[PDB]
């Protein structure tokens, strides 16, 4: 600490570097691809945000491909004291994402009560969708912990890009929805 972000470099520039170093050519081939796509699409597209829980009646999902405004109009219930992971499903199209991470500010009536962030990591472009699981964590419980919360979620990377920003609502009850 502190960590300085990598210098800007396109994938083409990378493959040109040490062009005839077979051990290094295989190394790049190992990490990068064997990728073409519409140049008019964002290099990174986070698709879904899934709640993974053993206790949950069914997997819960945040579709980040539609109108993000809708999540203010609704709430998401989470049974207190359960342990869970978060599955982040994203896609990379043209260039390397350098250290993409997930920032989550949890407010309660305009009061910041929690700040969590997960390092999703660095990913090159490919056709198949990517997937990142947070380590196992557990929701709080008690009369204080129970209640309604207001969440501001954000996806960024080492280049200070905001790939996605949206707010939504979380309610912690004694039991699940059903």
């Amino acid at each position: 600490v502190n960590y300085k972000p990598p210098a800007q470099k396109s994938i083409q520039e990378i493959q040109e570097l040490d062009k005839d170093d077979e051990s290094l050519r295989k190394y790049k081939e190992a990490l990068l691809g064997r990728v073409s796509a519409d140049p008019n699409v964002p290099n990174v597209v986070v698709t879904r945000l899934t709640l993974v829980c053993s206790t949950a009646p069914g997997p819960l999902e945040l579709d980040l491909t539609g109108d993000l405004e809708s999540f203010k109009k609704q709430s998401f219930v989470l049974k207190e004291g359960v342990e869970y992971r978060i599955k982040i499903s994203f896609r990379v199209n043209r260039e390397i994402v350098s250290g993409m991470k997930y920032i989550q500010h949890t407010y309660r009536k305009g009061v910041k009560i929690d700040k969590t962030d997960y390092m999703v990591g660095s990913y090159g472009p490919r056709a198949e969708e990517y997937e990142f699981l947070t380590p196992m964590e557990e929701a709080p419980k008690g009369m204080l912990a129970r209640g309604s919360y207001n969440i501001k979620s954000r996806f960024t990377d080492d280049d200070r890009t905001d790939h996605l920003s949206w707010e939504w609502n979380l309610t912690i009850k004694k039991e699940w929805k059903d």
Partner: protein
């Protein structure tokens, strides 16, 4: 009872002895003829504390030219081998300056093993003679151990890939760190 799969990534300054360390442990032979810049992903069977383990070995390119590409190997890492060279005190200086910042950034909770390579050159006279001209000397074990606790590593180890001495004890400690993990979430 099925073999446990753990991911090992090795980072550190260029030409500090990463690739040779991997090849030696993998194939039980130091490569004197040809050494790749980066070693292909080798999966090595290894048994520690009565536990069968399949150890996936990931070599990296420590060059600054790949400061953006190299981190692609980091996800799903279970244990990391942060390396420096005993004969290069400059390489040791990069441990808290370049490598610990990067590893802790991309691999937040992955256990770190600080490795001191080429320890056969510690009492080598040619090396000492060359280092003397920079008011420098080989790294002392105390210096390495100090740095390890400073960067909050799981443990300090030194080895000599050329003599194969210490290599085993490293990857055993690395496997041990990989085989283990209050409360976390959103309190």
């Amino acid at each position: 009872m099925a073999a446990i799969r753990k991911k090992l990534v090795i980072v550190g300054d260029g030409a500090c002895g990463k690739t040779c360390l991997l090849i030696v442990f993998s194939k039980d032979q130091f490569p004197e003829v040809y050494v790749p810049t980066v070693f292909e992903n080798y999966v090595a069977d290894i048994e520690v504390d009565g536990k069968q383990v399949e150890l996936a070995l990931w070599d990296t390119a420590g060059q600054e030219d790949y400061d953006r590409l190299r981190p692609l190997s980091y996800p799903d890492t279970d244990v990391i081998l942060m390396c420096f060279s005993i004969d290069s005190p400059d390489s040791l200086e990069n441990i808290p300056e370049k490598w610990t910042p990067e590893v802790k950034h991309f691999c937040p909770n992955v256990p770190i093993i600080l490795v001191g390579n080429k320890k056969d050159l510690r009492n080598d006279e040619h090396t000492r003679r060359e280092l003397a001209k920079m008011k420098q000397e080989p790294v002392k074990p105390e210096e390495g151990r100090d740095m390890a606790n400073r960067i909050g590593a799981f443990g300090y180890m030194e080895c000599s890939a050329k003599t194969k001495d210490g290599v085993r004890e490293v990857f055993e400690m690395a496997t041990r760190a990989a085989l283990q993990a209050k409360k976390s979430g959103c309190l």
